[PDB]
Amino acid sequence: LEEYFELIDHHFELRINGEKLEELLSERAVQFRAIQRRLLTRFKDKTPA
Amino acid sequence: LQPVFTLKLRHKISPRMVAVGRYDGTHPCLAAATQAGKVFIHNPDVSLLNINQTVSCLTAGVLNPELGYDALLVGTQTNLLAYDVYNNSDLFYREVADGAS
Amino acid sequence: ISILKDVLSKEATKREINEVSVKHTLKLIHPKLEYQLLLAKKVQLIDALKELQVHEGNTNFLIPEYRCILEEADHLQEEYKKQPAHLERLYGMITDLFIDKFKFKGTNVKTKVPLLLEILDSYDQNALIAFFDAA
Numbered sequence: 001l002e003e004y005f006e007l008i009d010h011h012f013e014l015r016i017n018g019e020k021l022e023e024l025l026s027e028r029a030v031q032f033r034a035i036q037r038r039l040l041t042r043f044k045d046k047t048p049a
Numbered sequence: 050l051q052p053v054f055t056l057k058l059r060h061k062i063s064p065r066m067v068a069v070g071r072y073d074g075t076h077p078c079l080a081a082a083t084q085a086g087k088v089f090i091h092n093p094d095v096s097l098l099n100i101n102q103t104v105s106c107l108t109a110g111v112l113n114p115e116l117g118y119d120a121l122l123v124g125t126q127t128n129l130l131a132y133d134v135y136n137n138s139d140l141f142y143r144e145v146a147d148g149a150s
Numbered sequence: 151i152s153i154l155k156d157v158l159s160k161e162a163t164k165r166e167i168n169e170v171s172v173k174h175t176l177k178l179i180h181p182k183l184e185y186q187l188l189l190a191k192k193v194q195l196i197d198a199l200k201e202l203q204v205h206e207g208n209t210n211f212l213i214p215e216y217r218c219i220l221e222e223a224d225h226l227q228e229e230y231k232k233q234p235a236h237l238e239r240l241y242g243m244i245t246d247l248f249i250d251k252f253k254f255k256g257t258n259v260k261t262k263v264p265l266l267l268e269i270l271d272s273y274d275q276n277a278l279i280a281f282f283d284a285a
Contacts, residue, residue, distance in 0.1 A: 030211040034202055041086075045102050046127045060204070084197075085204045 060089050063104065070109030070119030072134040080121050082107055088123055090134060102128065106149045112140060124149025152250035172251055172282060179244065180275055186237050187273065193230040196223045241270055248282065259285075 042049060066082035072090065079091040082104040090096045106124030111117075112131060120140055121132040126148045131140035199216050200223065202208075212220065219226065245263055252259040262285060269281055 027211060027213075031213060034206070034211055038201060041101050045086075047103060047125070049103060061200075083204065085201045087204060 056091075058089070058091060058095060060084075060095065066104055066107035068107055068109035068121070070121060071117075072109075072119055072121060074116070074118045074135065078134075080107060080109055088121075090121075098123075098132070098134075100125070100130075126150075152246075152253065167251075167254060172247070173279065175247060176275075176279055176282065179240065182236070183240055183270075183273060186233055186240065189226065189229055189233050192219050192226050193233075195219065196226055199223075241267070244270065251282075 060081075060083045063082035063084075066088075068080045069077055070080060071077045072080075076092070078093075081089055081091075083089050083097075086100045086102045086104060088098045088100055088104060088107065090098065100123055102125050104123055105126050106122070108122045109119045110122075112120040112122075118133060118135055121134050123130045123132065127144065127146060129141075129143045129145055129149050131142075133140055195216065196219060199212070199220055202212070203220060208217075208220070245266060248266060249259060249263075266281065269278055
């Protein structure tokens with residue numbers, strides 16, 4: 001019950017790290033989508049810029 | 050004198066692109082260009098219109114005297130758009146190819 | 151001291167080095183050039199980020215890095231107006247320092263200037279001091 005809890009805690013630390021990495025990937029993907037939409041708007045436009 | 054009213058609008062106004070027009074027919078409002086090619090409308094809340102294109106002219110007047118509404122005009126270096134903001138419907142979207150300076 | 155030597159010799163015609171001083175002057179200069187380059191790098195992206203600012207109200211997406219620039223955009227932009235004069239003055243001061251500190255030893259290094267200009271376009275401070283001590 002004590003060398004068994006440390007493995008549980010390692011597992012849960014990895015889980016929490018994964019959730020953090022995923023919520024960061026969400027923000028990065030949102031940024032990429034926003035900049036991509038801006039670029040698409042610049043593409044559809046006729047006038048140079 | 051003294052400014053009879055003041056207000057702060059969070060959007061950068063492009064210099065020569067400003068107009069006042071009674072877009073509700075009897076309710077005057079402000080139309081002004083902004084960065085990113087969007088034209089904002091201040092009613093007395095700010096409402097955005099996605100021109101999605103770098104504006105170069107903007108005015109507002111009576112284009113068909115049959116009705117009493119001001120038509121919001123928006124010129125671009127390759128387009129020209131009249132807009133009935135009240136009933137959102139293009140009066141005419143002409144393509145100039147000579148520009149709107 | 152180089153300017154003093156030249157001007158006093160001119161007046162006369164009318165009528166020692168610490169080997170670490172260059173290091174001290176370059177360490178003095180480094181923060182100013184760093185600030186000018188960061189100024190340029192931020193003002194390059196100010197307007198591009200402002201185009202993104204006008205949409206979706208900036209609630210969840212903008213990186214904190216550029217979010218630090220979205221606020222101080224105004225001060226950055228108004229200092230960028232004066233930046234180029236400071237950058238040119240710093241480049242001139244550095245090239246005069248280099249030319250003079252090689253002139254005291256009796257050399258004429260008026261030719262290696264363009265390499266120094268390129269180095270400053272890069273501005274590797276350690277490579278800068280290396281180019282100072284070597285050639």
